[PDB]
Coordinates of C-alpha atoms in Angstrom, one line a residue:
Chain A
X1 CA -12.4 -7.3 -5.3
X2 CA -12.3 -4.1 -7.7
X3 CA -9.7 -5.2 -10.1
X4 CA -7.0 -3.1 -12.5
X5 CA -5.7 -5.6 -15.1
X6 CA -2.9 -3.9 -16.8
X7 CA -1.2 -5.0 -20.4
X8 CA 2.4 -6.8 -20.4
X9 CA 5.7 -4.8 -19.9
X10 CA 7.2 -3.0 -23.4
X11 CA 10.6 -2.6 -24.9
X12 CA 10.6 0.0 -27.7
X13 CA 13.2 2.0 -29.4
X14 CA 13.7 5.9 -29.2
X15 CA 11.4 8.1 -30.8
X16 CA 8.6 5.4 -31.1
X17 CA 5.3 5.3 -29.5
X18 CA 3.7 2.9 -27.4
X19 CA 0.1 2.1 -26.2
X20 CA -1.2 0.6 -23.2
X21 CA -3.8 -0.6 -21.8
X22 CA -6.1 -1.2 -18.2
X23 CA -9.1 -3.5 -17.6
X24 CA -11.1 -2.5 -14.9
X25 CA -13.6 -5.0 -13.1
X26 CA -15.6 -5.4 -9.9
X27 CA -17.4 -2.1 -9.9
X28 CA -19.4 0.2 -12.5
X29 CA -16.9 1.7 -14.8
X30 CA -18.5 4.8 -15.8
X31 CA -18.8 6.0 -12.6
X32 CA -14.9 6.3 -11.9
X33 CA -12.5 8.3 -13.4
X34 CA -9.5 6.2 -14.7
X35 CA -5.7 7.7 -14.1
X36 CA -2.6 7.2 -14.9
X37 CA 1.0 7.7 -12.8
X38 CA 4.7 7.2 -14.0
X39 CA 6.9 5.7 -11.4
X40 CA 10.4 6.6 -12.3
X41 CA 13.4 6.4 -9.6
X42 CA 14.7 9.6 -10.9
X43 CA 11.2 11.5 -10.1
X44 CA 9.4 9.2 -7.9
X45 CA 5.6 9.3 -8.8
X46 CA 4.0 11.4 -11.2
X47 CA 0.4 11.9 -12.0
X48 CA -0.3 11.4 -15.8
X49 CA -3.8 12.8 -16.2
X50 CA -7.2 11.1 -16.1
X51 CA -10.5 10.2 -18.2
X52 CA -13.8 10.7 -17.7
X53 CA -14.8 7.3 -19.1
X54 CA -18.7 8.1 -20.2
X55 CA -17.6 11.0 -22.6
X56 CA -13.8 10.6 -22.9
X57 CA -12.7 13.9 -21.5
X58 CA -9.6 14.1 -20.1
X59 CA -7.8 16.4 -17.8
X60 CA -3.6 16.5 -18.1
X61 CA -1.0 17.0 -16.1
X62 CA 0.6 19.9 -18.0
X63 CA 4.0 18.2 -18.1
X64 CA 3.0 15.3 -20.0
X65 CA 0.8 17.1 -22.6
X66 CA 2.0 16.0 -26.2
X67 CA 3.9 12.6 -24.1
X68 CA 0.5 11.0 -23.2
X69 CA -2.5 10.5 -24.6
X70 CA -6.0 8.7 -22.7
X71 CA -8.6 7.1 -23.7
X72 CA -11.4 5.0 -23.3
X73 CA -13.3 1.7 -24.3
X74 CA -16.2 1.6 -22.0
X75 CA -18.0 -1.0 -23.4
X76 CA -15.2 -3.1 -22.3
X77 CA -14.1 -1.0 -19.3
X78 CA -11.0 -0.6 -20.9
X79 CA -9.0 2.0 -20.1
X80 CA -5.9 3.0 -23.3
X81 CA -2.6 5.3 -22.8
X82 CA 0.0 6.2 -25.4
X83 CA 3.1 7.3 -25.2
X84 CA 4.7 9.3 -27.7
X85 CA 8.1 10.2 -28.9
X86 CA 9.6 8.2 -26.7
X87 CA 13.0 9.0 -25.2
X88 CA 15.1 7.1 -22.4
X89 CA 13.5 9.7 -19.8
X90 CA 10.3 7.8 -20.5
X91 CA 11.7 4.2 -18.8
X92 CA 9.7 3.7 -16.0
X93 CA 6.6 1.9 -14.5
X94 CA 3.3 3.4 -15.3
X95 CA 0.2 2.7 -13.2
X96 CA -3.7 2.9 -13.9
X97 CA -5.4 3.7 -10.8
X98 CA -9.3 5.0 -10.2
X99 CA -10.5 7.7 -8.4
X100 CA -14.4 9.2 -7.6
X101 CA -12.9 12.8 -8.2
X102 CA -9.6 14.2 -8.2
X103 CA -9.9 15.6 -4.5
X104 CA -10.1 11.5 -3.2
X105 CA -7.7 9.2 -3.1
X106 CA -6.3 6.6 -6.0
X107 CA -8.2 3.9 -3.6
X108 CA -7.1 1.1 -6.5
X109 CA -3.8 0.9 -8.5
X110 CA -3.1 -2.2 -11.6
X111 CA 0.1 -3.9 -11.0
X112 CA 1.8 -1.5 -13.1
X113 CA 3.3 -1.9 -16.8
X114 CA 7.2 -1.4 -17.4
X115 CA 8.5 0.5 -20.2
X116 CA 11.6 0.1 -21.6
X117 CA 13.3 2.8 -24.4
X118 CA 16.3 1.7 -25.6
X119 CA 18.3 1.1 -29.1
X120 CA 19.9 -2.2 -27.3
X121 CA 18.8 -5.3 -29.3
X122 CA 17.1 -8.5 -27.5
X123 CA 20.1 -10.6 -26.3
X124 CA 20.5 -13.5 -24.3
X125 CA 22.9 -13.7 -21.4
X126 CA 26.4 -15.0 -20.7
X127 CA 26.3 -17.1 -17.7
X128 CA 29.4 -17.5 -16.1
X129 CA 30.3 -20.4 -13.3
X130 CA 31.8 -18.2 -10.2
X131 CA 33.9 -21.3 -8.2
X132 CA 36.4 -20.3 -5.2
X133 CA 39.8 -19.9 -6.3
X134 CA 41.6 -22.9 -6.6
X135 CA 42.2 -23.3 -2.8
X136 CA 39.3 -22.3 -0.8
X137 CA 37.1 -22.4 0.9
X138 CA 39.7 -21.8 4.2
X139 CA 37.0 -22.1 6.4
X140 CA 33.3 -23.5 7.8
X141 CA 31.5 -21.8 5.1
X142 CA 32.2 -21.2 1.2
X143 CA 30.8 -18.9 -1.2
X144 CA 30.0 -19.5 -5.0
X145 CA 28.7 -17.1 -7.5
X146 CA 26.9 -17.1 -10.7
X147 CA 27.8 -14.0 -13.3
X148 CA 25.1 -13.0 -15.8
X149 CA 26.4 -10.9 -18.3
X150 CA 25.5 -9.3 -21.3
X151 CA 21.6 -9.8 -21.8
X152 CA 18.9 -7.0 -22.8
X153 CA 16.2 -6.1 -21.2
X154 CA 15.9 -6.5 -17.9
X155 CA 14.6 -9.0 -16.1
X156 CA 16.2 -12.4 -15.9
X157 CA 15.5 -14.9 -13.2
X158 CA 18.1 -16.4 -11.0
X159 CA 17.6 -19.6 -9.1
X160 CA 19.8 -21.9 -7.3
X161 CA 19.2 -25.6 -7.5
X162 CA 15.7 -24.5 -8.7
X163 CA 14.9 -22.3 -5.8
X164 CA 15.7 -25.3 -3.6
X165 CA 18.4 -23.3 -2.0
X166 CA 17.0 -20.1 -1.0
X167 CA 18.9 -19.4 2.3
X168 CA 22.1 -17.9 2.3
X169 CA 21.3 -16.3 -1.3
X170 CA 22.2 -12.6 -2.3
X171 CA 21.1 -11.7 -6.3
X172 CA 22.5 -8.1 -6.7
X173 CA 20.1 -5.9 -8.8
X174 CA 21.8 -5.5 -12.5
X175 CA 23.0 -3.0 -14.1
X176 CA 23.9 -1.2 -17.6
X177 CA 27.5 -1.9 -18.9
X178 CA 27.9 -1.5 -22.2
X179 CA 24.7 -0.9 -22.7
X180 CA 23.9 -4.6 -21.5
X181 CA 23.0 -5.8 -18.3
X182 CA 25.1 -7.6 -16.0
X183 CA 23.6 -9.1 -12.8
X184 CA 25.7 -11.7 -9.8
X185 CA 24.4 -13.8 -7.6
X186 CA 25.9 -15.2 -4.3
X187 CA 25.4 -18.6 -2.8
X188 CA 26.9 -19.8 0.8
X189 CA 26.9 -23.1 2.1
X190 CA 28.8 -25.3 4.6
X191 CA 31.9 -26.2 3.1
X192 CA 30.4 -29.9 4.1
X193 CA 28.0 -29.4 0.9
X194 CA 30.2 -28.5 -1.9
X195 CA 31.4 -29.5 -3.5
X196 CA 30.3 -33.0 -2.7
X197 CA 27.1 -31.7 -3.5
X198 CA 26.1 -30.1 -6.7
X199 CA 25.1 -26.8 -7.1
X200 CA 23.4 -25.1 -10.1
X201 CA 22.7 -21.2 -11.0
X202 CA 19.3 -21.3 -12.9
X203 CA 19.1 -18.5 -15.2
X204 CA 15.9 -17.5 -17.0
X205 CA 15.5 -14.5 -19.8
X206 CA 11.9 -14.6 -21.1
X207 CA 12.5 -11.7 -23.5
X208 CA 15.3 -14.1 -25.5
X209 CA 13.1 -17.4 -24.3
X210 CA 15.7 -18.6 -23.1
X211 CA 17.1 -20.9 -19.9
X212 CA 20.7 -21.6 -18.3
X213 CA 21.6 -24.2 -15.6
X214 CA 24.8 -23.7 -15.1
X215 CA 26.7 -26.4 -12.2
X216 CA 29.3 -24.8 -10.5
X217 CA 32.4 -26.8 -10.6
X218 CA 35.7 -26.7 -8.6
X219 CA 38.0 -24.7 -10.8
X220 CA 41.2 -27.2 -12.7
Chain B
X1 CA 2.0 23.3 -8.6
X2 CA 1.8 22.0 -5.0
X3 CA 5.3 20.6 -3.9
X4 CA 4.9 17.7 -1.6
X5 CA 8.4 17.0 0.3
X6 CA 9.3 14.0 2.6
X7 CA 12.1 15.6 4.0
X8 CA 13.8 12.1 5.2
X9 CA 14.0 9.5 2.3
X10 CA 15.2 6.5 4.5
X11 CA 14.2 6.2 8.0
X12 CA 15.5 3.0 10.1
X13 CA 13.7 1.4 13.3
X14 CA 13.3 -1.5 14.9
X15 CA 10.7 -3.7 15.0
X16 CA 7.8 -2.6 17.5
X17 CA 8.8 0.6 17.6
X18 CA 6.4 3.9 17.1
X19 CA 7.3 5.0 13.5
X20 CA 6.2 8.6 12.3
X21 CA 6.6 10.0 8.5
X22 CA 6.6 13.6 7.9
X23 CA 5.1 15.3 4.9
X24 CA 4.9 18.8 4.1
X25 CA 3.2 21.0 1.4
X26 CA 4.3 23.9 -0.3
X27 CA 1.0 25.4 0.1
X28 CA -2.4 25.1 2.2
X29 CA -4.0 21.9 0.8
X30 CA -6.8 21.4 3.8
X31 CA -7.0 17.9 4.4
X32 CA -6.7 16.7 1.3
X33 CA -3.7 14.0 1.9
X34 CA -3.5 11.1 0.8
X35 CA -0.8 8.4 1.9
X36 CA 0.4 5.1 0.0
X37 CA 2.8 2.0 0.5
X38 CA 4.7 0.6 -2.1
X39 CA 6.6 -2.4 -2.2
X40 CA 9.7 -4.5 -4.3
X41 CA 6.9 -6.5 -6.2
X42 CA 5.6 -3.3 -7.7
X43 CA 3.0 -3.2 -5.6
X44 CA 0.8 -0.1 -4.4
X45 CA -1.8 0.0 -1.9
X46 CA -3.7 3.2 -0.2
X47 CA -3.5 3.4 3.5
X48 CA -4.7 6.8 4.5
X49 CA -6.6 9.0 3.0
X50 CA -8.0 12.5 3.8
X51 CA -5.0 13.2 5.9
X52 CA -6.2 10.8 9.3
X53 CA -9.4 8.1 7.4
X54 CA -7.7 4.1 7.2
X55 CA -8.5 2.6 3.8
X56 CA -10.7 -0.7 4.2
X57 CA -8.4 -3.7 5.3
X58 CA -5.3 -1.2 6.3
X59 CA -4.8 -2.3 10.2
X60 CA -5.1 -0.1 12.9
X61 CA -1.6 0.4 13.8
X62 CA -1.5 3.0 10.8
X63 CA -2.9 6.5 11.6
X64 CA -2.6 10.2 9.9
X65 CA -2.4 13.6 10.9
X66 CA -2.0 17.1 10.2
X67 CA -3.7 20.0 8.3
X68 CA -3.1 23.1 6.2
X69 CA 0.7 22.2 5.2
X70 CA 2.7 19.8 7.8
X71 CA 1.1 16.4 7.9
X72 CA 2.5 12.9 8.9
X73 CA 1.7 9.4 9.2
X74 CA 2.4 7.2 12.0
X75 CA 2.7 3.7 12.4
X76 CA 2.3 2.6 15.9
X77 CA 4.4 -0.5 16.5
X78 CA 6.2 -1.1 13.7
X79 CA 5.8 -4.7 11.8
X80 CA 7.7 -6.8 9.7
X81 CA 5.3 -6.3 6.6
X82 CA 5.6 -2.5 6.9
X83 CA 9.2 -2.5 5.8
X84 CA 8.1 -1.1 2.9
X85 CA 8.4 2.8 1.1
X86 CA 5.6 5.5 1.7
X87 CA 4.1 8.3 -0.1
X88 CA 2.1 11.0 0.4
X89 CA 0.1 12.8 -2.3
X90 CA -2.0 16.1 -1.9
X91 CA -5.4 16.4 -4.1
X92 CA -6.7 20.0 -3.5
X93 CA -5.4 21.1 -6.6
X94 CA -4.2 20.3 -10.2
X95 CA -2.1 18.9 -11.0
X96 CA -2.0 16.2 -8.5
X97 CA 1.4 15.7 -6.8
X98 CA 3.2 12.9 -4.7
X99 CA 6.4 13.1 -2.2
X100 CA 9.7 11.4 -3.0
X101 CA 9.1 8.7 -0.8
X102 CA 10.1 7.2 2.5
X103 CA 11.9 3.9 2.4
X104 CA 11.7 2.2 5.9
X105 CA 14.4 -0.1 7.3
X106 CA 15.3 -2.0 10.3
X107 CA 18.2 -1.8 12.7
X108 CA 20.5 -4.2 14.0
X109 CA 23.9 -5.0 15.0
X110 CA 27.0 -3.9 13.1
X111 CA 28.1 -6.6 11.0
X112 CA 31.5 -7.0 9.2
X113 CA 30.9 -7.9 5.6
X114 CA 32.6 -11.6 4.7
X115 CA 34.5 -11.5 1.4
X116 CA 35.0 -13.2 -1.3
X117 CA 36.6 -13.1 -5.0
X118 CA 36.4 -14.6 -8.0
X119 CA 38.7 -14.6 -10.9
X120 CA 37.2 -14.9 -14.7
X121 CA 35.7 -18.5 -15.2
X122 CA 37.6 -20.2 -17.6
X123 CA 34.4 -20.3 -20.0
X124 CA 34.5 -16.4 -19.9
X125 CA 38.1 -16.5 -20.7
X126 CA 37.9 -18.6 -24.1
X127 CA 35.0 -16.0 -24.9
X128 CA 37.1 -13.3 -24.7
X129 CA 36.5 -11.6 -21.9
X130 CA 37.6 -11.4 -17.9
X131 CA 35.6 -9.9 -15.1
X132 CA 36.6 -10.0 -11.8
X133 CA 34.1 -10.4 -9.0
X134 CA 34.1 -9.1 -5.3
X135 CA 31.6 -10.3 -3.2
X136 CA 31.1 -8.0 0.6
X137 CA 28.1 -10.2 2.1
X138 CA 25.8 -9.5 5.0
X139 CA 27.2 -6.5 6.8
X140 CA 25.7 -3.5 8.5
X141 CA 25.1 -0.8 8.6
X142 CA 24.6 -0.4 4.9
X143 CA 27.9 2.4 4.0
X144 CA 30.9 0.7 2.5
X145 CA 34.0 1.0 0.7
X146 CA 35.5 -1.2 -2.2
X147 CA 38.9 -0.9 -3.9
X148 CA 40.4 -3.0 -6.4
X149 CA 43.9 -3.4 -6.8
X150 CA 45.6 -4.7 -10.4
X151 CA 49.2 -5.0 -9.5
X152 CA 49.3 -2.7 -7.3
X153 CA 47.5 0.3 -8.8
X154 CA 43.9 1.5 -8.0
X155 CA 41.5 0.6 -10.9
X156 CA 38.2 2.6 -10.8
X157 CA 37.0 2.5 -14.4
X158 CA 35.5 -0.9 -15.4
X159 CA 34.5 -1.4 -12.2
X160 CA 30.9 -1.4 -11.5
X161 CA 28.7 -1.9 -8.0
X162 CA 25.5 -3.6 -7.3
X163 CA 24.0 -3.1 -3.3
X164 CA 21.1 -5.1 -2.5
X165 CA 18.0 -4.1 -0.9
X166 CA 18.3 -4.9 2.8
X167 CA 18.1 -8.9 3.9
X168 CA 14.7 -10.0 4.7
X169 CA 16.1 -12.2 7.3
X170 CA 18.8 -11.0 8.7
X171 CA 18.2 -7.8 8.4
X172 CA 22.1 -7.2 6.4
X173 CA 23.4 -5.7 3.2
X174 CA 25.4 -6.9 0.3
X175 CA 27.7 -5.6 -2.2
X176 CA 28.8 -7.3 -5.6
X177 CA 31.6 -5.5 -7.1
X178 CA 32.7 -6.3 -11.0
X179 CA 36.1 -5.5 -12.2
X180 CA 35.8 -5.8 -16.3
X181 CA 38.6 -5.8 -18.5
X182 CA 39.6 -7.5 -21.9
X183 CA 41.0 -10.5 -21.7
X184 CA 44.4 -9.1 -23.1
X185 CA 44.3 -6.7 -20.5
X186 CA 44.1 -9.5 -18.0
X187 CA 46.2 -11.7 -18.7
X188 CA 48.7 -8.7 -19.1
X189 CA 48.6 -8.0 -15.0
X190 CA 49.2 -10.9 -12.3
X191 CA 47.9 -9.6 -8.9
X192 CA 44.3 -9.1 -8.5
X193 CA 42.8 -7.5 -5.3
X194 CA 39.4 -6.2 -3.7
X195 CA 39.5 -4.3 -0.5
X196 CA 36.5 -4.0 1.6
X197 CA 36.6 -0.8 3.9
X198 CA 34.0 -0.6 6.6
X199 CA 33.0 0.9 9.7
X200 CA 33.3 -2.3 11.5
X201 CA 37.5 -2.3 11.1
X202 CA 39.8 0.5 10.6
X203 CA 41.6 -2.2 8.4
X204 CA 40.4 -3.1 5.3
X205 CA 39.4 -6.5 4.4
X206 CA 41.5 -7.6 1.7
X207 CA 41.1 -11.1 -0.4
X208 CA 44.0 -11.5 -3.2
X209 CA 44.4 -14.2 -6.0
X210 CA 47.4 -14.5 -8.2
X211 CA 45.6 -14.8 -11.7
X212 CA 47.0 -19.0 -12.1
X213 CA 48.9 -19.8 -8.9

């Protein structure tokens, strides 16, 4: 039941700083050390450093001296790491997780806190109907599509008919184009459901708060 | 520092099979090995550490082994809820350092990949702007091709590729392929085509629209 509650994913511009944060719970605090890893799928995982959290002493990993800072709130088992002068090199996930000493293993990991460095500006997505072209489907099955373009950051949700049609569903991970992200989504059904029944790609961006049902209609 | 490498990044098996994961150090680190699962959710777990000891609550199909610098971690009949990618991580000496990762998948049959395309929707033509959209759905194995024709002639820049990760279910792979362009630059051109080249036919599968037929 040991628990590592970690803060709420980040979006901040180059050259800023960012702090964040790990609740531990379920064991004594103090007699842990706290640690942090990077997750970054350009370098895999990466050990931060840890904190002694009864006198604050820290021990880094030499390539993120000056990048990270640690520290420590032990009344409220609490433990704190900044980021400094950030750069898009410094996108990633980062992890708290506990050890007894550095010679044992990182036995518990948070969920991990995503970082996001950027100059892009907060923007909802486009969400465009994909229909067949006017004159399929040819066959037993036929394909529609939902095209999310144009939103910042990452993530959005995609549903179709609310997550009521979950078979047959491929969501493609998104990616950067000019400097927004763009994301599709397949759905395939027996051409004895659309469209005599109706089908809807539910979008969702919580960093715009903002929500898209867009039906997919047979093209004029 | 202590180099940790995981010489094969993607290893595919089927289910029930004996699955073992090589790790190798740069340097002598004892036992001091340390192995851990991570998953799409974000999610990491240890599963063996010490080079051979199982984490509380890891099952007994997971098992370590090694010493000095070669070290590896076996799984012995391979389960649905291990597709998954593993790391190992050596601790006898600062800085602490973790191998690239090993990303499991299954095998199956060779599919060929079903196409689809899409021209612009006519809402993203009043806003101004056209993409294109390919759809190569539920083939295997995962390597494929995708060309886009405009008229005739190959068009590689604007055109960007998504793969997902492989299917849950039926064990498949799926490629979305966006051809962007301005919508003057569309409406400039008549004949749009994405051709999907795969191991599965030495001819391409081609689908074709005429922008308003």
């Amino acid at each position: 039941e040991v628990q590592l509650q970690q803060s709420g994913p980040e979006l901040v511009k180059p050259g800023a700083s960012v702090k964040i944060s790990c609740k531990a719970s379920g064991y004594t605090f103090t007699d842990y050390y706290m640690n942090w890893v990077k997750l970054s799928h350009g370098k895999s995982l990466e050990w931060i450093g840890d904190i002694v959290p009864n006198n604050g002493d820290t021990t880094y990993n030499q390539n993120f001296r000056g990048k990270a800072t640690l520290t420590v709130d032990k009344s409220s088992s609490t433990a704190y790491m900044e980021l400094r002068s950030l750069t898009s090199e410094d996108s990633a996930v980062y992890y708290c997780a506990r050890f007894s000493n550095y010679v044992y293993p990182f036995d518990y990991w948070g969920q991990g806190t995503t970082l996001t460095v950027s100059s892009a500006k907060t923007t909802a997505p486009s969400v465009y109907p994909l229909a067949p072209v006017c004159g399929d489907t040819t066959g037993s099955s036929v394909t529609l599509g939902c095209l999310v373009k144009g939103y910042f950051p990452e993530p959005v949700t995609l549903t179709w008919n609310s997550g009521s049609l979950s078979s047959g569903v491929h969501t493609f991970p998104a990616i950067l184009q000019s400097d927004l992200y763009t994301l599709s989504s397949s759905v395939t059904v027996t051409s004895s459901t659309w469209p005599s029944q109706s089908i809807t790609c539910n979008v969702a961006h919580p960093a715009s708060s903002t929500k898209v049902d867009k039906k997919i209609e047979p093209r004029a | 520092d202590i180099q940790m490498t995981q010489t094969t990044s993607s290893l595919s098996a089927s289910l029930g099979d004996r699955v073992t994961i090589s790790c190798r150090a740069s340097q002598d680190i004892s036992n001091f090995l340390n192995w851990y699962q991570q998953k799409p959710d974000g999610t990491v777990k240890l599963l063996i550490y010490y080079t051979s000891r199982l984490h509380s609550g890891v099952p007994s199909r997971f098992s370590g082994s090694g010493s000095g610098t070669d070290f590896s971690l076996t799984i012995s009949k391979l389960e649905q809820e291990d597709i998954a990618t593993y790391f190992c991580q050596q601790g006898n000496t600062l800085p602490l350092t973790f191998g690239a990762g090993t990303k499991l998948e299954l095998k199956r049959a060779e599919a060929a990949p079903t196409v689809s395309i899409f021209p612009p929707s006519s809402e993203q033509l009043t806003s101004g702007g056209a993409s294109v959209v390919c759809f190569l759905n539920n083939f295997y194995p995962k390597d494929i091709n995708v060309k886009w024709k405009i008229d005739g002639s190959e068009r590689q820049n604007g055109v960007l590729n998504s793969w997902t990760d492989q299917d849950s279910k039926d064990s498949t792979y799926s490629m979305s392929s966006t051809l962007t362009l301005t919508k003057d630059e569309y409406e400039r051109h008549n004949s749009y085509t994405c051709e999907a080249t795969h191991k599965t036919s030495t001819s391409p599968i081609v689908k074709s629209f005429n922008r308003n037929e």
